[PDB]
mmCIF file of C-alpha atoms in Angstrom:
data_model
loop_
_atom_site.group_PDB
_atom_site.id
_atom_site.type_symbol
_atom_site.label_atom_id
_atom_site.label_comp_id
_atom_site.label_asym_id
_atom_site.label_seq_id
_atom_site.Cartn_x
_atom_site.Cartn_y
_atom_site.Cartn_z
ATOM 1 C CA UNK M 1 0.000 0.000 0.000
ATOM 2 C CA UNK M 2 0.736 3.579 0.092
ATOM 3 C CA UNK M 3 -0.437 7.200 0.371
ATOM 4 C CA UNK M 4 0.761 11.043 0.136
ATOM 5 C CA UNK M 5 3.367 10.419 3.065
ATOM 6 C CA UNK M 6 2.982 12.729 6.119
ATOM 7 C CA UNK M 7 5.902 13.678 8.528
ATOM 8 C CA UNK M 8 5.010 16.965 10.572
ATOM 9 C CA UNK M 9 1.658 17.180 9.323
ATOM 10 C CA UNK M 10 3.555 18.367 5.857
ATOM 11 C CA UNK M 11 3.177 16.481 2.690
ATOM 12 C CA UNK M 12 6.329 14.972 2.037
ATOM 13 C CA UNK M 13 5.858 12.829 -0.844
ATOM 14 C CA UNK M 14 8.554 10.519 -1.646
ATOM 15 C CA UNK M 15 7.279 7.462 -2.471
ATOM 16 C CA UNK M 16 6.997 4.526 -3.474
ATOM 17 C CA UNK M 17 11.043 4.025 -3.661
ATOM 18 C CA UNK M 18 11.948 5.878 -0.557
ATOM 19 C CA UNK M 19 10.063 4.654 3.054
ATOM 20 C CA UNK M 20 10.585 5.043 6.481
ATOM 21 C CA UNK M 21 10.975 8.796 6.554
ATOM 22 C CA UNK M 22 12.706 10.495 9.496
ATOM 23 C CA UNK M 23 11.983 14.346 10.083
ATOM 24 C CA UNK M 24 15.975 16.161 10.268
ATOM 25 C CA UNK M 25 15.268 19.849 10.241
ATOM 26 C CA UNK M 26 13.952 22.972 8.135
ATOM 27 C CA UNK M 27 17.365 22.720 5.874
ATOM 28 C CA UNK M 28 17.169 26.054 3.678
ATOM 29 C CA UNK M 29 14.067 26.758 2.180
ATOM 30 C CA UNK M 30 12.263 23.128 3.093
ATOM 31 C CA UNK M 31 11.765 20.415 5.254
ATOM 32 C CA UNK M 32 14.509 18.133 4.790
ATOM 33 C CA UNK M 33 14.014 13.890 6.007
ATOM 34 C CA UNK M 34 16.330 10.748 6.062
ATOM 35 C CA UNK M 35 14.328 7.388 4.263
ATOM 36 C CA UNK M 36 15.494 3.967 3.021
ATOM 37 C CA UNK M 37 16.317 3.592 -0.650
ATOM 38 C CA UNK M 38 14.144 0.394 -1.437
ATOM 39 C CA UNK M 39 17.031 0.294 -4.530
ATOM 40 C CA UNK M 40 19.723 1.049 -3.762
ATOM 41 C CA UNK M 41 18.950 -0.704 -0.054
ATOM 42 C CA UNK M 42 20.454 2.249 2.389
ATOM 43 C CA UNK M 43 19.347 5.158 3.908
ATOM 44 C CA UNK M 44 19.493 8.708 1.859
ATOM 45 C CA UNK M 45 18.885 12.444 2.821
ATOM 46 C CA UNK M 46 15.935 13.939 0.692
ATOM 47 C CA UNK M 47 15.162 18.117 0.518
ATOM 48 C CA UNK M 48 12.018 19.161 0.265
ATOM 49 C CA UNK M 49 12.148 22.482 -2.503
ATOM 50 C CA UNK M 50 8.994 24.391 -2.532
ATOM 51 C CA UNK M 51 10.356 27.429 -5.337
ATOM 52 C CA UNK M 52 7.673 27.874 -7.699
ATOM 53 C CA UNK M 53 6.118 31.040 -6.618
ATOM 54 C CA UNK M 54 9.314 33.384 -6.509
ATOM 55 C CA UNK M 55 11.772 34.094 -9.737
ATOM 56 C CA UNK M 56 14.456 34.261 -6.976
ATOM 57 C CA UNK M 57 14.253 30.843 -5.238
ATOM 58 C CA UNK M 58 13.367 29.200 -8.999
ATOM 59 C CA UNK M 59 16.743 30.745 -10.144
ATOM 60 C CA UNK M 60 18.701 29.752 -7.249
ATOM 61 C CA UNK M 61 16.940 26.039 -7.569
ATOM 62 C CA UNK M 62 18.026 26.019 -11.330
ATOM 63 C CA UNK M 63 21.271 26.899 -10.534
ATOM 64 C CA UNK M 64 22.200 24.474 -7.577
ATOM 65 C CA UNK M 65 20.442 21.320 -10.054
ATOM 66 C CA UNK M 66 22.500 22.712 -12.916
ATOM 67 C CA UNK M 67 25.878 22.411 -11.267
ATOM 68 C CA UNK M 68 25.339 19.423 -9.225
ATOM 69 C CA UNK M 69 24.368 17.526 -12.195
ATOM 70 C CA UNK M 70 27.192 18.540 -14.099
ATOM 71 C CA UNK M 71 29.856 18.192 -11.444
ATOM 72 C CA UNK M 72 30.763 14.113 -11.040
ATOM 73 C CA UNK M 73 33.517 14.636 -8.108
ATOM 74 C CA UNK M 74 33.741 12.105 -4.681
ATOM 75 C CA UNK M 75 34.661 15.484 -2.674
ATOM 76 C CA UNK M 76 31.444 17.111 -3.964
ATOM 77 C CA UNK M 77 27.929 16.357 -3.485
ATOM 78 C CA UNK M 78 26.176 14.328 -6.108
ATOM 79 C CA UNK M 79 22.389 14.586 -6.541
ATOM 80 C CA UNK M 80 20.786 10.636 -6.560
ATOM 81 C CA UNK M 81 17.514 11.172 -7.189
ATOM 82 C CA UNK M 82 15.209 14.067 -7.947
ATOM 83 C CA UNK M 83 11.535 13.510 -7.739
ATOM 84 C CA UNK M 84 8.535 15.762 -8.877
ATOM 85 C CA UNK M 85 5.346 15.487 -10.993
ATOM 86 C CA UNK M 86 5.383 14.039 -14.254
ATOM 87 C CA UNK M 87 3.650 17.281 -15.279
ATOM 88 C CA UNK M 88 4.890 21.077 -15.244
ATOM 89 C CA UNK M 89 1.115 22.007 -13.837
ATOM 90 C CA UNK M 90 1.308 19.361 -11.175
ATOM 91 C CA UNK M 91 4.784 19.908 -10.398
ATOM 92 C CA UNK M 92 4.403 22.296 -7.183
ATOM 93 C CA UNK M 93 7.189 20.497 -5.208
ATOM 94 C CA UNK M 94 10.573 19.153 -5.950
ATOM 95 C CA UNK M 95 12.522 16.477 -3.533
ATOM 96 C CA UNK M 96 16.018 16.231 -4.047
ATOM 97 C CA UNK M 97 17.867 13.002 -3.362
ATOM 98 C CA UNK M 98 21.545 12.744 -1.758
ATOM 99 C CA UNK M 99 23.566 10.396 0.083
ATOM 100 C CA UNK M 100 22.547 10.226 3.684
ATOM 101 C CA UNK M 101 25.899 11.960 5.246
ATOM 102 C CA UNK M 102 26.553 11.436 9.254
ATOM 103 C CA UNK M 103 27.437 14.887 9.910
ATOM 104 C CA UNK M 104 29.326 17.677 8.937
ATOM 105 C CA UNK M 105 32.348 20.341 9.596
ATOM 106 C CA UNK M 106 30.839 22.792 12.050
ATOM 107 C CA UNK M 107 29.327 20.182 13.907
ATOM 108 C CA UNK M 108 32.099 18.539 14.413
ATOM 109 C CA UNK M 109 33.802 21.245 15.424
ATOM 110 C CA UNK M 110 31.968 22.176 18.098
ATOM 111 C CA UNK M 111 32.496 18.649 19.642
ATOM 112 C CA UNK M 112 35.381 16.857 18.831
ATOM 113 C CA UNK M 113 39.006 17.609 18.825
ATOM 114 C CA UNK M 114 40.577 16.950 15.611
ATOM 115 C CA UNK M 115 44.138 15.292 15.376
ATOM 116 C CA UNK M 116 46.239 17.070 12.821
ATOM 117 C CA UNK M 117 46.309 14.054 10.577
ATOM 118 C CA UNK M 118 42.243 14.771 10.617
ATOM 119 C CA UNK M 119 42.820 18.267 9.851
ATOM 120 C CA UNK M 120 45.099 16.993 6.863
ATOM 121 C CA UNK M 121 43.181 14.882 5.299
ATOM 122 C CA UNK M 122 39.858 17.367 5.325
ATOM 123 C CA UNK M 123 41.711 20.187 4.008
ATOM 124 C CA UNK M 124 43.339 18.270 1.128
ATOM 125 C CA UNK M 125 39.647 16.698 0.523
ATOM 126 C CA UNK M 126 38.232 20.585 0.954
ATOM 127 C CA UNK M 127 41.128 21.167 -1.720
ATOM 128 C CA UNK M 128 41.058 18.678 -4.326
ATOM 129 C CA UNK M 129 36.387 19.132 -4.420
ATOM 130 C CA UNK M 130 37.647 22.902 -5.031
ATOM 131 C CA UNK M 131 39.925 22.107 -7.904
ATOM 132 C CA UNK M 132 37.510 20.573 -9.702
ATOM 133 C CA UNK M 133 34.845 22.877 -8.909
ATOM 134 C CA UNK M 134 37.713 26.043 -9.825
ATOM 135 C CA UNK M 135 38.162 23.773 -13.050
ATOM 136 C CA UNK M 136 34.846 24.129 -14.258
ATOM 137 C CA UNK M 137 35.042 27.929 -13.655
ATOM 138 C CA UNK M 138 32.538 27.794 -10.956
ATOM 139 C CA UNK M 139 32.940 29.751 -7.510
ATOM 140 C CA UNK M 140 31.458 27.948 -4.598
ATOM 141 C CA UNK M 141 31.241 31.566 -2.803
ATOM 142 C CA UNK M 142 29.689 29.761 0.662
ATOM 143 C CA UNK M 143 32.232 27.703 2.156
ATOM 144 C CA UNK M 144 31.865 26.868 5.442
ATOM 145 C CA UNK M 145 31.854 24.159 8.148
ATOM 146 C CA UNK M 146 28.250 23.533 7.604
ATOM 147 C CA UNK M 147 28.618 23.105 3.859
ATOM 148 C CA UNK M 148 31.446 20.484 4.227
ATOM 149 C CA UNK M 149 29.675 16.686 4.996
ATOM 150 C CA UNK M 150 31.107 14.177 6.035
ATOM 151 C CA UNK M 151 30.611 10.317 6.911
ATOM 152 C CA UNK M 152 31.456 7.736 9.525
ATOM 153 C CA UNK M 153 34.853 7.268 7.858
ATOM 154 C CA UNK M 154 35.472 10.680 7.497
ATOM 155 C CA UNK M 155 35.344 11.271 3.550
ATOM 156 C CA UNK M 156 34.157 14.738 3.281
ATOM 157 C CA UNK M 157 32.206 16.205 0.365
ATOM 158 C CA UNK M 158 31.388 19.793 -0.254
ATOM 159 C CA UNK M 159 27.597 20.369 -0.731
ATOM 160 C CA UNK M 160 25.412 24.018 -0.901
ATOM 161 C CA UNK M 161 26.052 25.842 -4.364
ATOM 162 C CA UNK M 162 23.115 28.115 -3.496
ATOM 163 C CA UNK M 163 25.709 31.292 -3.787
ATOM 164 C CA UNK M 164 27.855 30.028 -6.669
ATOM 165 C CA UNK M 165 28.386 31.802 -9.858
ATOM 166 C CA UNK M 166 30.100 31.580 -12.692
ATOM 167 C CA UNK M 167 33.274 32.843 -12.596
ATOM 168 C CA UNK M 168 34.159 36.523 -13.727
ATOM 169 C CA UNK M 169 36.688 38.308 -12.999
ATOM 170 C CA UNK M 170 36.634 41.303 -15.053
ATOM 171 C CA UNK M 171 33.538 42.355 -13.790
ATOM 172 C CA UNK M 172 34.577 42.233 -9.671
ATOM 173 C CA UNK M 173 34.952 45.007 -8.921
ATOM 174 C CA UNK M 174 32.355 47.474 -6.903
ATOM 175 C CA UNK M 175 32.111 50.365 -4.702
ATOM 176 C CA UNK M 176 32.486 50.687 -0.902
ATOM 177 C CA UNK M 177 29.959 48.754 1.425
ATOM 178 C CA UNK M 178 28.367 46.305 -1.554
ATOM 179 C CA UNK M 179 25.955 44.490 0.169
ATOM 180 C CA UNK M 180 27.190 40.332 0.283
ATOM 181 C CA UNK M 181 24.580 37.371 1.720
ATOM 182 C CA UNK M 182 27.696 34.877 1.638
ATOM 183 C CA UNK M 183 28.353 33.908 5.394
ATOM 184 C CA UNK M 184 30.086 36.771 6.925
ATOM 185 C CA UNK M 185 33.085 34.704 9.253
ATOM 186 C CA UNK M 186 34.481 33.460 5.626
ATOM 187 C CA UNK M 187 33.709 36.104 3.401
ATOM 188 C CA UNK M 188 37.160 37.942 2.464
ATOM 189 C CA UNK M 189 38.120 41.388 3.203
ATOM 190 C CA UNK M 190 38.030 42.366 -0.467
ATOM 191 C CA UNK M 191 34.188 41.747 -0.868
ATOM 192 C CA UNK M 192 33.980 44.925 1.910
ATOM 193 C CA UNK M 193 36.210 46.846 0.198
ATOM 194 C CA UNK M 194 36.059 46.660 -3.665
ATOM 195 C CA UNK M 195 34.955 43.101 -5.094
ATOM 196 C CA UNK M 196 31.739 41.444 -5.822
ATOM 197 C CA UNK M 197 33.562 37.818 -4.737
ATOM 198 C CA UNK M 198 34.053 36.667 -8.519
ATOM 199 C CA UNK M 199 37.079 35.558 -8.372
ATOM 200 C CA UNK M 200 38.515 32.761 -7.219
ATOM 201 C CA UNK M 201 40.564 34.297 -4.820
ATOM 202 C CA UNK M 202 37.253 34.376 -2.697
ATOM 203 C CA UNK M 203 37.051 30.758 -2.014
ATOM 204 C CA UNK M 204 40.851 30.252 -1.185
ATOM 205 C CA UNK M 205 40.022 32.889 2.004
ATOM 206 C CA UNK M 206 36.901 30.880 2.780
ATOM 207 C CA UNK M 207 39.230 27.615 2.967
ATOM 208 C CA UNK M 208 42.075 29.467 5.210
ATOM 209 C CA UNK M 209 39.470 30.359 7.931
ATOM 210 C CA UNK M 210 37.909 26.885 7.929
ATOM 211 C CA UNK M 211 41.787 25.541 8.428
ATOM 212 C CA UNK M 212 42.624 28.087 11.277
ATOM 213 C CA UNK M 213 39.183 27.005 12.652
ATOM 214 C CA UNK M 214 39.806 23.197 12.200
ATOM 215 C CA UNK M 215 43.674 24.215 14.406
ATOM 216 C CA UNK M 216 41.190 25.865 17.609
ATOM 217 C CA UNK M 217 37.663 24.395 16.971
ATOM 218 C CA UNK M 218 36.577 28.231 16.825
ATOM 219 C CA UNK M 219 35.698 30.680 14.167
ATOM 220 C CA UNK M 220 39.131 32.952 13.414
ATOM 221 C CA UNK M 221 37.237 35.932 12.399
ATOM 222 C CA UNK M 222 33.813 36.147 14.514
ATOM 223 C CA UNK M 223 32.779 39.311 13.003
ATOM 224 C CA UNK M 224 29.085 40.661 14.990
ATOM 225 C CA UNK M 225 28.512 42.855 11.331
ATOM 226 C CA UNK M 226 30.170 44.135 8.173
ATOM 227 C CA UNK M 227 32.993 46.358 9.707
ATOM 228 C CA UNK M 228 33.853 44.281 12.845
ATOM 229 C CA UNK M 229 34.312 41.404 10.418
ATOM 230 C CA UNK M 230 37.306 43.784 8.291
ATOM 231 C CA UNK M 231 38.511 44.777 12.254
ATOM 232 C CA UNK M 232 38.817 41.207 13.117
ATOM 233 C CA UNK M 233 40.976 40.273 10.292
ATOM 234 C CA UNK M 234 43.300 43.481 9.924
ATOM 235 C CA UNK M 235 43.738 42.700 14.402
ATOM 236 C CA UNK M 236 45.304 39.034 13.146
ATOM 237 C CA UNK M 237 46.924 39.696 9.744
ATOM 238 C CA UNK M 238 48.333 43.649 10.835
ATOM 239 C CA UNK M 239 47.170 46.632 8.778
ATOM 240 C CA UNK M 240 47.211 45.980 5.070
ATOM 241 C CA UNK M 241 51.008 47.706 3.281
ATOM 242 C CA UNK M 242 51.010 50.320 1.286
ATOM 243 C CA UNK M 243 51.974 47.868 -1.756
ATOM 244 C CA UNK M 244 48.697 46.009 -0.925
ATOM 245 C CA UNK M 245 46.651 49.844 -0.698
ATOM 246 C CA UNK M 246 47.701 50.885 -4.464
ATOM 247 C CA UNK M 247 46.315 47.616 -5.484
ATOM 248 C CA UNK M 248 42.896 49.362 -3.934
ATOM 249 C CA UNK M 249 41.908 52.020 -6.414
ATOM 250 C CA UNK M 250 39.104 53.033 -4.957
ATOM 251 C CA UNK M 251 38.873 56.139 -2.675
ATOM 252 C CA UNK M 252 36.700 55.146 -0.306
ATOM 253 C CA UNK M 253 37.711 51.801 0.537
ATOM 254 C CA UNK M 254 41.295 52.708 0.258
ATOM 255 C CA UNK M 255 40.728 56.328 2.997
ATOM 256 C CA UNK M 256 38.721 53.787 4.803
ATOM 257 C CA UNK M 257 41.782 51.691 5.624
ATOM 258 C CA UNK M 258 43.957 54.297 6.072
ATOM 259 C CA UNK M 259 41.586 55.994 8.694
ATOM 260 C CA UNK M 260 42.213 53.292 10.996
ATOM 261 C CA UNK M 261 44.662 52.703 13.990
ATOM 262 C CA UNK M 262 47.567 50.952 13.126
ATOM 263 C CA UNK M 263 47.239 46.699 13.931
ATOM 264 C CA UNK M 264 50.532 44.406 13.775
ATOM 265 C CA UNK M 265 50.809 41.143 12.245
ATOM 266 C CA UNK M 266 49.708 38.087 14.927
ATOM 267 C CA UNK M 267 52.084 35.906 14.728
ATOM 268 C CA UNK M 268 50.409 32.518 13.487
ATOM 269 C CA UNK M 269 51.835 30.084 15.834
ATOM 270 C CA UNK M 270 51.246 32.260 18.960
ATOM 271 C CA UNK M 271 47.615 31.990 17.699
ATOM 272 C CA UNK M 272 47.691 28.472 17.293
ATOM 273 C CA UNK M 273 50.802 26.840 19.232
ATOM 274 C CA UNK M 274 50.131 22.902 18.540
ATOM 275 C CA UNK M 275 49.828 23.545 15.035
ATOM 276 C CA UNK M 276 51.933 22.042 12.409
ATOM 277 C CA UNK M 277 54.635 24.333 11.388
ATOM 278 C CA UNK M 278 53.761 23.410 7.609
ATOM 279 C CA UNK M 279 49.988 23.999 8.537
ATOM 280 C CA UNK M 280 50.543 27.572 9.370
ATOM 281 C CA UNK M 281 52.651 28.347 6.603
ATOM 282 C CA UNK M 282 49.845 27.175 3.878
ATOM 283 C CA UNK M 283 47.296 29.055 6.487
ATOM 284 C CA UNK M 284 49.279 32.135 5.977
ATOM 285 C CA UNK M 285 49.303 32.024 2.126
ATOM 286 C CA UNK M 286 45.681 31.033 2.167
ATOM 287 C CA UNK M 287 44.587 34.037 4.310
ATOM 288 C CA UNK M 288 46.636 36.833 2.956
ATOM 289 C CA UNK M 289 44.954 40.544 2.309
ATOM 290 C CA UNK M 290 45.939 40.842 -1.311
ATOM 291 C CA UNK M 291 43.679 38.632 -3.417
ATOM 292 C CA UNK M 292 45.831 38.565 -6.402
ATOM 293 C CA UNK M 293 48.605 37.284 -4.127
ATOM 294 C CA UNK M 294 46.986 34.117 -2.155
ATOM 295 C CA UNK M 295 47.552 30.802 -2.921
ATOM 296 C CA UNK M 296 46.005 29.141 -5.617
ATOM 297 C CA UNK M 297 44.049 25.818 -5.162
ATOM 298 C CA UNK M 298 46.156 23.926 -7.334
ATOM 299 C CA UNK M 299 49.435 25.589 -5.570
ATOM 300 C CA UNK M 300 47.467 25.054 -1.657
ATOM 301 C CA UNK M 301 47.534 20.999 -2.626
ATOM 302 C CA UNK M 302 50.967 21.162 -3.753
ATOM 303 C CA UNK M 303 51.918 22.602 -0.728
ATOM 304 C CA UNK M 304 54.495 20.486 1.590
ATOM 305 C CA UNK M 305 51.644 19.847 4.436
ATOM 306 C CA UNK M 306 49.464 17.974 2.455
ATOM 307 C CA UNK M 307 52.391 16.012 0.588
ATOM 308 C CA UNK M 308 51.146 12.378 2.197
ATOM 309 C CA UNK M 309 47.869 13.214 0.007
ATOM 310 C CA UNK M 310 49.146 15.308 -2.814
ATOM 311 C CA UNK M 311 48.885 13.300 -6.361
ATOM 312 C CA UNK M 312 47.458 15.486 -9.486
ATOM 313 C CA UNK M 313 46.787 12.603 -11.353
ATOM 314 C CA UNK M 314 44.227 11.481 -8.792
ATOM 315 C CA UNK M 315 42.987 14.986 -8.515
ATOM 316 C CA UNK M 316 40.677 15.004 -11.499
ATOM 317 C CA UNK M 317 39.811 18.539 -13.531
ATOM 318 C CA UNK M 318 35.708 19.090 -15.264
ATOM 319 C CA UNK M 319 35.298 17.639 -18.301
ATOM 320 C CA UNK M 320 32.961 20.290 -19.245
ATOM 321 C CA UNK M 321 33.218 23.566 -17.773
ATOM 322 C CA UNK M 322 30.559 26.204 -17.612
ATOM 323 C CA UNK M 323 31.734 28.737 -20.369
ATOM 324 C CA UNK M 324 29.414 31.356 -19.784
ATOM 325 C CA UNK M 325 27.200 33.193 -17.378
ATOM 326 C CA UNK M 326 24.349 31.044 -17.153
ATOM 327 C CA UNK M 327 13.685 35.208 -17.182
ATOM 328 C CA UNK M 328 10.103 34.961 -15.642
ATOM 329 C CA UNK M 329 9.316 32.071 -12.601
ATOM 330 C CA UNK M 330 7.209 30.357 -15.402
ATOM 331 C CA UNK M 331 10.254 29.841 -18.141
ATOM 332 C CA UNK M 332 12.568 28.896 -15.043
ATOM 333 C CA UNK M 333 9.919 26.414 -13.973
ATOM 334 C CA UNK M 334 9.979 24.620 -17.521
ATOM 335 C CA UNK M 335 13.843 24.839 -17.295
ATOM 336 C CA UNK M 336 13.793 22.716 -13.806
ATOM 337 C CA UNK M 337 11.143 20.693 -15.284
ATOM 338 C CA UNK M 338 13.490 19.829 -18.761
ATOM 339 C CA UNK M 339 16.236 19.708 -16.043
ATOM 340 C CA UNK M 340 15.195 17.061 -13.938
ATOM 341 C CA UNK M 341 13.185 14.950 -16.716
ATOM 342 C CA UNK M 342 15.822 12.288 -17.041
ATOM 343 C CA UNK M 343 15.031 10.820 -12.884
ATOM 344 C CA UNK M 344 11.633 10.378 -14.720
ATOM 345 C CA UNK M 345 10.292 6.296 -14.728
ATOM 346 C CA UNK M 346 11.495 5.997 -18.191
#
């Protein structure tokens, strides 16, 4: 037998091929539940996506699909199963279908001490999903603990693409105080100053913090709003030099930084003094003020700390990158409808 599944007394309608639901949380925009996969005989995380009625949240829900169907990468991610209507006007719901992981980075965090072996081998996995993902000239733009899952044996795979874009540097750069909805604790000081975060450059920073906050089990950069965020990292890195200003061009970002009391440098292993001398000095290249000179991804995995791990021929690149920048709600709905046709019974 079966029905329309309940769980909360919300429809959450599944079935037949996933049973025995369990209610996890309100995830982003949905309900999200863990059920059995009567197929592939294990238990699987399904999101509930309810983004018909707003352009925004039907973009955003293109988007995420878009990539994750694209990208085929064991550090990212990968969408299972996606399950809606067989019709566009009885499509009002969308379940998405991913492997069932047993937690993730920030929870971890605020529980468990990790041994620096752990730390390793997460931020070589966190390194070798965002080479692939870089590859494919895609910025993740929301890296964080929370968006890093990981199982019972510790394999770790980067999920969220909500925020990501395209990549496009020639058109990042903005004025002073450009509003950002990216996490602020791993946004990077540029996106206050002058940059939109399309670069790649932005997800490098986001990696450093989660390292230095993988070394404490605490955030490095707690900022409580947009300025306190630029205060906490200019307190730990020292006042940006006066090479790094000219690369700031604009006025008001630039007489910003120079209105403000001088800060020296933090040394990095009086901040963190178990850490592996080799951890800190990828940390520092990873969270350095200048965009245009921090580490690369491809550079960050070459780097001597992660040299048990390191092997670019195991460290696969996108077939098929997205070449360009990617509309009413009713076109995007047929898009996610053509989209997710092929998990159709057929």
């Amino acid at each position: 037998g079966a029905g329309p599944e309940m769980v909360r007394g919300q429809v959450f309608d599944v079935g037949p091929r996933y049973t025995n639901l369990s209610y996890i949380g309100e995830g982003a925009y949905g309900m999200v539940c863990s059920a059995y996969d009567n197929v592939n005989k294990v238990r699987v995380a399904i999101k509930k996506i309810s983004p018909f009625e707003h352009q925004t949240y039907c973009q955003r829900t293109l988007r995420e699909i878009k990539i994750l169907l694209r990208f085929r990468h064991e550090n990212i991610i990968g969408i299972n199963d996606i399950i809606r209507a067989p019709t566009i006007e009885q499509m009002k719901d969308v379940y998405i279908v991913q492997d069932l992981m047993e937690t993730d980075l920030y929870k971890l965090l605020k529980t468990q001490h990790l041994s620096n072996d752990h730390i390793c081998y997460f931020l070589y996995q966190i390194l070798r999903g965002l080479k692939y993902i870089h590859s494919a000239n895609v910025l993740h733009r929301d890296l964080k603990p929370s968006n890093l899952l990981l199982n019972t044996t510790c394999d770790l795979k980067i999920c969220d693409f909500g925020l990501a874009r395209v990549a496009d540097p020639d058109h990042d750069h903005t004025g002073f105080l450009t509003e950002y909805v990216a996490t602020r604790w791993y946004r990077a000081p540029e996106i206050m100053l002058n940059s939109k975060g399309y670069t790649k450059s932005i997800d490098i920073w986001s990696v450093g913090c989660i390292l230095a906050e993988m070394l404490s089990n605490r955030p490095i950069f707690p900022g409580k709003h947009y300025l306190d965020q630029l205060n906490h990292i200019l307190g730990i890195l020292g006042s940006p030099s006066q090479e790094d200003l000219n690369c700031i061009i604009n006025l008001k970002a630039r007489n910003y930084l120079l209105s403000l009391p001088h800060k020296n440098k933090v040394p990095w292993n009086r901040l963190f003094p178990n850490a592996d001398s080799k951890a800190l000095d990828l940390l520092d290249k990873m969270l350095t003020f200048n965009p245009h000179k921090r580490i690369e991804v491809e550079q960050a995995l070459a780097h001597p700390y992660l040299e048990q791990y390191y092997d670019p021929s195991d460290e696969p690149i996108a077939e098929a990158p997205f070449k360009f920048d990617m509309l009413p709600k009713e076109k995007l709905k047929e898009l996610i409808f053509e989209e997710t046709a092929r998990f159709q019974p057929g």
